[PDB]
Amino acid sequence: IRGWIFGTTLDSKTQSLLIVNNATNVVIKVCEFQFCNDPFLGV
Amino acid sequence: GNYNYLYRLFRKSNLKPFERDISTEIYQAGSTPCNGVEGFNCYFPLQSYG
Ligand SMILES: *[C@@H]1O[C@H](CO)[C@@H](O[C@@H]2O[C@H](CO)[C@@H](O)[C@H](O)[C@H]2NC(C)=O)[C@H](O)[C@H]1NC(C)=O
Ligand SMILES: *[C@@H]1O[C@H](CO)[C@@H](O)[C@H](O)[C@H]1NC(C)=O
């Protein structure tokens, strides 16, 4: 488990908090991200 | 007339304190649903200052 998405529609129409922890780098953004139909991170 | 400054004119509910709404969804003010298209009882939520 490496992150979280918070919002209302999660489809680039509103602002959605995105938290990702990749290895040693915690990344926090509040952009209007365009998420995939089934968001995931590959290895 | 400077028309770059806008303000929200319609919203289904009042903002909570320190809430920021920048959505431009077409406001449905009548019983007929709006499909994202401006028109009768279907408002663009932002108005421009004079
Ligand atoms: C925050 O967003 C939610 C939806 O993501 C808003 O809930 C909507 O409230 C209106 C009434 O004002 C209902 O007609 C909608 O059906 C609700 N949406 C859902 C998905 O149930 C909520 O009002 C928003 N908060 C504020 C303060 O505007
Ligand atoms: C984690 O992702 C951010 C951008 O999302 C990137 O800048 C950073 O370098 C990444 N960290 C690693 C260890 O790859």
Q: Is A14 on the interface with B (CB under 8 A)?
A: yes
Ligand 2 center from residue A25 Cα (angstroms)? 6
Q: Is B30 helix (H, G, I), strand (E, B) or coil?
A: coil
**Cβ-Cβ contacts under 8 Å for B23 (sequence gap 6 or more):** A13, A14, B45
For residue A3, give the ligand nearest its CA. 2
CA-only gyration radius of chain A, Å: 11
Q: Is A29 on the interface with B (CB under 8 A)?
A: no
CA-CA distance, B31 to B27, in Å (whole number)?
11
Which letter, b or e, does each residue of A2-40 get, where b requires 16 or more Cβ atoms within 10 Å of its Cβ?
A: eeeeebeeeeeeebbebeeeeeeeeeeeeeebeeeeeee
Phi then psi for residue A19, to 5 deg, are -120, 125
Resolution (in Å) of the shown entry? 3.5
